Amino acid sequence: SAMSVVILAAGKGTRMYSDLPKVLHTLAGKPMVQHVIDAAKDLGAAAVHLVYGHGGDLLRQTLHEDNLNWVLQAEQLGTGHAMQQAAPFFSDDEDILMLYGDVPLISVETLQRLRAAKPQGGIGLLTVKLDDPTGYGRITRENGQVTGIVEHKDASEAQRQIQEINTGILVANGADLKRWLAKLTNNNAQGEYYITDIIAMAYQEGHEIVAVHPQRLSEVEGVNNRLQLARLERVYQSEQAEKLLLAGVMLRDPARFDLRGVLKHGRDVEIDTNVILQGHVVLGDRVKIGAGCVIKDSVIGDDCEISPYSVVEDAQLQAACTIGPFARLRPGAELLEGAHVGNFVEMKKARLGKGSKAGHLSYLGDAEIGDNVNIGAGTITCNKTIIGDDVFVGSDTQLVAPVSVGNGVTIAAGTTVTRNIADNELVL
Amino acid sequence: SAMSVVILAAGKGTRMYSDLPKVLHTLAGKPMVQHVIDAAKDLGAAAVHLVYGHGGDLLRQTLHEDNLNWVLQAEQLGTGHAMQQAAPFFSDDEDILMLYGDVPLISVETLQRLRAAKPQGGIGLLTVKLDDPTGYGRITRENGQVTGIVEHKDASEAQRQIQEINTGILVANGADLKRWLAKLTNNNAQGEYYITDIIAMAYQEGHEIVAVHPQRLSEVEGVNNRLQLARLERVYQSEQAEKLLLAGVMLRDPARFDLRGVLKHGRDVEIDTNVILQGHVVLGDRVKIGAGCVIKDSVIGDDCEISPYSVVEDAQLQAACTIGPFARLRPGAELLEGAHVGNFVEMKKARLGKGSKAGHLSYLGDAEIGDNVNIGAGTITCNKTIIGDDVFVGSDTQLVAPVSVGNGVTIAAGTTVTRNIADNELVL
Amino acid sequence: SAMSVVILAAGKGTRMYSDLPKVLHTLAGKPMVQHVIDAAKDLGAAAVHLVYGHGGDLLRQTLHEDNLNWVLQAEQLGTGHAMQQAAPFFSDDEDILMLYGDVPLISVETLQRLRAAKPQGGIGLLTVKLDDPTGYGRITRENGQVTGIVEHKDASEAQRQIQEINTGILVANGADLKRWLAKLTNNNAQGEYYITDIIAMAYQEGHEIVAVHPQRLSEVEGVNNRLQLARLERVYQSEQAEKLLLAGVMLRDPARFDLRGVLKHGRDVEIDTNVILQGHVVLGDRVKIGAGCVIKDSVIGDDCEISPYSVVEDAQLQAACTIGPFARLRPGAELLEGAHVGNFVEMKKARLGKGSKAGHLSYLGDAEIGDNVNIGAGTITCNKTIIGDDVFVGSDTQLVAPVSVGNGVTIAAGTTVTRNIADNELVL
């Protein structure tokens, strides 16, 4: 049926020691909470009620979704209190799913299982078994059926023996949640309203609670300091690296591979050590990536070979291109088939012709290069400048924009150019 | 006595998701099967019968050995079938060793032990003990003597308790193998001919089977997808790094060290993080390698210091040379004693004089530099060009090949050179 | 009370396979023994008696401390013999602490606990419990009180069952040590004098030995070959990385982070993969460090962003500066607020003006740049050269030191400059 998601970002992140609200800190180039939001959209949630208690300005500034509903928690009286703030927006028919902004790695597949498990008029609860539960609410089951959740402090000595604990993620009818949430109370040592209390309410009402379990423990792990964030970073990266390897993308060393975004890979792609991929990268068949490269929001043609320690940003490479080592492609760069970019060469808003080489110490700016052109070592453009097909450029040539150069033109070393040059005309 | 090796590359590598046959995929810069071939040559195998079922063109294209004998397996009817294809080439006197192209890390030392263990007219079989054998053929021993191998499917419940399993590597007389291989049959669920059946044949004939065990489990691990290949890559690299450390080569971080080839190291060599060595590298005493460097098929003199993020290919450095950071040496580069190559400097088919510096933004091409020369920042050569001893070159000087420059010549900044220059003559 | 430290560097480092004495080899940019010396100074040791048997010249050459007292051990007759050599310098009142130069990671906090534990006229001994003690002296306790140390060779079969072993670190009154050290003897298979014998002497005299335990086993681990050194390197680095993460410094990947020295970090600092920090680095609030950067003895202003694969040495950056990618800052470089250094740009003993850009292929040497200056791509200085505020420099301009350039000057591309330039004067 229909569903909505409640993401909780109310928890204050003092241990982060940051001015940025905890949930906005990045994991793999994307804020933690955005991982949770993206899961909610995949599941098809109609609305995403985000509950925050601090850093409102930064949260709205960073996060923009059409269905994003902002819910203030004036003071931090606990998970149960937070769900009360969002309860008015719950629709009676829709199932309401409860997620946390500091638990980025919850899997969409595990959430789909949780929804199926929800009995009607009942609750589906994500639970996990820990070799050592300590300070964790313990699932209490009689005759194999869930009856409630016992906080560790209130835990009896027998209940401190239960391996199963509470993740805090659950699913319930929207109307049911509004009924239980009204019954909540603050009479307890902390003074908080604990969401866990609704599980007992369901059992007392004769409704059933069904528990499912996550595939990995990482899915339910949450972040409270930079160290745990760095740990989940490595978990996420290694999870992606194994998938890519089994999909036929070779990684020389999976531990030294960072993917921040989405990769579309052809067959027989090879990626060496310490490569970082960012944004949306597209790699063709038989693409090679040298050690230490960084590629962001770029497309690489089939059979291109990027040599080591090259940096590419929003560039478009056709097939058979080669670049690097130490090449640098600014945004808007573009190479045609067979083009070579050499070491210590930069390109901004420029296009290099087919079979055109800029082998050394050359900067190209707001320029267009013809096919089969040869760019001299040390060539520099003070940007727009255009060059025709089959031009040769002398070593250390300077071209002052706007300069157009004719097809077949040949230019002498050391030349400095301020006028345009006729086709097939030698210039010195 | 005499020996030959049968390498099996018949297994088809669908899980690799590749056009390249599985056994050709690289581990540490060398195809897996080539690891096996190289082991066979160390052992002194007279012939290496490679049995393939697909990708013949690529295999012959890649692998060239004088003793390499190519054996087609028309269809993939199992290991026993494959050994039948090679059986005609077996010599009666020679012992025949059975290896696999997807098991790259089998150790030469473990294979030497296997040969000694072979009883005459009998079989030596490599076996290993696994905490969890599942789907593995189980060694069956009566009174401590081997009697056969039991596939897991046919395994009885007691036999599913045996820790010892079959590696698939074995040694037998060449004549014996031809006798057993004839007796093989396809009557079984798969329809394959299992090589494991010969072990029972030996026991029924009264001949003895003797089992040895590998030193590491990695030696017998085989590759069927990119992930397992990447795992063996890390195993191999870490095995080399420990050896180098105990041999007196310091590695700042062994996990971030990749050796693809053979290293000859002097004493007191230090290698920082994320260095990659390729081909055949020779390092002198007290050589330093900066973080991120890549060295291929190059020789570095005693006491040379390569600064970080330098790339060197087929270069020859004398003692006391320094290069980098961000230096780049194309093939054929050569430095004399005391020479310095600075950042953003490239050298192709060039030689730098003794105590000669090219500190900045300089490209050198098909050139020869005299001793004590100073190369200006921005110097560029449009290649052959020669420079005498004790020359000074102005910043941003261009030299058009072929230009010869006299000893003691001093050249002005911005100069562009098309003629030769007399000794001790200032030029502007 | 007062204290002194005895560091033992007598052990000869044959397994290191080095000409450099073992204790001088570096861990995190600092010689192992210097870790021990630095611990001793934190504890406030009045004197540090270093006992060496070889490589005296290199040790004095490398290690310079005001309180460093050098004690020769003519021949290597064991720890007890070494302490005899230093015993004359012990003061009666001062407690004497026994440390080892090959145990770099001993913690100052664990040593403070050891001192408190020392009974008067008695001994405090650092001990540890090992799942497998083998070849380790075993602590022998009767009624819970220490009575002696039993070498493993002399160990009885019951004593080979004791988990507690001897670290070799201990504390005793200076006078007491002189009394026990006199009683030592060489009558044993090795012929050595074992320091462990004094523990029994104390028990026989009725004095008490009190054992404390280290926090980590790494604190008491010692180095005898390059491999163990590399292991302690990784232990030390990962220990620092966790501290920085909990302190609010984000590390994208803690395993790929090396700190060699001391870091002062503002809030919300982010450090990407494979960064190396050296010497004394100071980072402001919200500083970003790109993948692969190296920073040494440098100060980075608030909000500076260092792009990847940049190398910085003894540079001083004000707030809001940006540099890289592929930027290189030689020692003495300095940037003013808002300055940008682009790719393939070097700076030595130079200062870049506020909001001043050197975007491409530019070398700056012994120069001073005015605010709002624009530095053309390919600009080169043959160093002192000065530039006024609001100057523009053409692409590939060369300036020959000493050249002063006026405020507001604008210079043409390809120009080469040997004279000074008047304010607001265009030059070509």
CB contact under 8 A, B227 and A246: yes
β partners of residue C5: C48, C97
| Distance, CA of C282 to CA of B192 (rounded, Å) | 68
A206/A185 same-domain check: yes
| Chain B CB contacts of A252 below 8 Å | 230, 233, 258
Return the CATH number at C265.
Answer: 2.160.10.10
- Looking at CA atoms only, how far is residue C126 from chain A in angstroms? 31
* Contacts for A265 with CB less than 8 Å, ≥ 6 apart: A244, A247, A248, A249, A283, A287
Half-sphere exposure of A3 (CA within 13 A, CB side): 22
Residue B126, beta-bridge partner list: B212
**Can you give the length of chain A in residues?**
428
CATH classification of the domain holding B163: 3.90.550.10
How many CB atoms within 10 Å of residue A116? 10
Range B287-296, long-range pairs (CB < 8 A, 24+ positions): B290/B324, B290/B325, B291/B252, B291/C274, B291/C276, B291/C292, B291/C294, B292/A291, B292/A292, B292/A309, B292/C274, B292/C292, B292/C309, B293/B324, B294/A291, B294/A308
Residues A289 and A377 in one domain: yes
User: Residue A178, SS3?
Assistant: helix
Annotated binding residue A374? yes
Query: For chain A, what is the largest distance between any 2 Cα atoms, rounded to a whole number of angstroms?
Result: 95
Q: Give the range of the structural domain holding residue A397, as residue numbers without chain letter.
A: 233-427
Is residue A372 a known part of a binding site?
no
In a domain, A311, yes or no: yes
Instruction: Kindly state whether residues C59 and C156 are assigned to the same domain.
Output: yes
| Same domain for B360 and B341 | yes
Same domain, C116 and C209: yes
- In a domain? residue A11: yes
Polymer length in residues for chain C: 428
CB C415 within 8 A of CB C394: yes
Residue A364 C-beta-side C-alpha neighbours within 13 Å:
36
Q: Which of C234, C245, C252 to mutate to probe the A interface, most A CBs <10 Å?
A: C252
Q: Compute how many other C-beta atoms are within 10 angstroms of the C-beta atom of residue B101.
A: 28
User: Amino acid identity, residue C427?
Assistant: V
Q: Domain check: are C209 and C313 in the same one?
A: no
SS3 content of chain C, % helix, strand, coil (to 5): 20, 35, 45
Residue C227 maps to a domain: no
Closest A-chain CA to C428: A416
Instruction: Kindly compute the dihedral angle of the four CA atoms of residues B252, B255, B256, B262, in this order, to the nearest 10 degrees.
Output: 90
**Are C207 and C117 within one domain?**
yes
What is the Cα–Cα distance from B189 to B152, expressed in whole angstroms?
A: 13
Last residue of a domain, one of B159, B191, B220: B220
Q: Which residues of A touch C343 (CB under 8 A)?
A: 328, 346
Q: B137 and B28 share a domain?
A: yes
C93 plus C27 within the same structural domain: yes
Cα angle A321-A330-A418, degrees, rounded to a multiple of 5:
95
Sorted by sequence, the CB contacts under 8 Å of residue C306 that are 6+ apart come out as C287, C288, C289, C290, C293, C295, C300, C312, C322, C323, C324, C327
Which pair of tokens denotes residue C30? 């600092």
List the one residue out of A221, A295, A204 whose CA is nearest residue A257. A295
DSSP C119: P
Helix (H, G, I), strand (E, B) or coil at A197: helix
Q: Which chains have at least 3 CB atom pairs separated by less than 8 Å from chain B?
A: A, C
Asked if the structure places residue A228 within a domain, the reply is no
| Burial environment of residue A389 by CB neighbours within 10 A (0 to 12, 13 to 18, 19 or more) | middle
Identify whether the C-beta of residue A398 lies closer than 8 Å to the C-beta of residue C414.
yes
> What is the 8-class DSSP label of residue C421?
B
Q: Are residues B103 and B214 in the same domain?
A: yes
Q: Is A227 contained in some domain? A: no
Cα distance between residue A58 and residue A50, in whole Å = 13
Alpha carbon distance B140, B155 (integer Å): 10
Cis upstream peptide for C214 (omega within 30°): no
Concerning whether A25 is annotated as a catalytic residue, the answer is no
**What is the C-alpha to C-alpha distance for residues A50 and A86, in angstroms, rounded to an integer?**
8
Q: Let me know if residue C188 belongs to a domain.
A: yes
Complete edge-to-edge strand list for the sheet that includes strand A398-400: A380-382, A398-400, A416-417
Count the domains in chain A: 2
CB contact under 8 A, B382 and A273: no
Q: Of the residues B190, B220, B250, which one is the last residue of a structural domain?
A: B220
Sequence-distant (≥ 6) Cβ neighbours of residue B388 within 8 angstroms = B370, B404, B405, B406, B407, B408, B409, B423
Residues A139 and A253 placed together within one structural domain of the fold: no
Last residue of a domain, one of A190, A220, A250: A220
Same domain, A204 and A255: no
Which pair of structure tokens corresponds to residue B116?
A: 């000694």
Method: X-ray
User: How far out from the chain centre does Cα A208 lie?
Assistant: 37
Exposure of B17 by Cβ count < 10 A (0-12 exposed, 13-18 middle, 19+ buried)? Answer: middle
A225 in a structural domain: no
Tell me, yes or no, whether C284 lies in a domain.
yes
In whole angstroms, give the CA distance from residue B103 to residue B105. Answer: 6
> In this structure, what token pair is assigned to residue B172?
């037998």
Mark yes or no for CB contact B361/A344 under 8 Å. Answer: yes
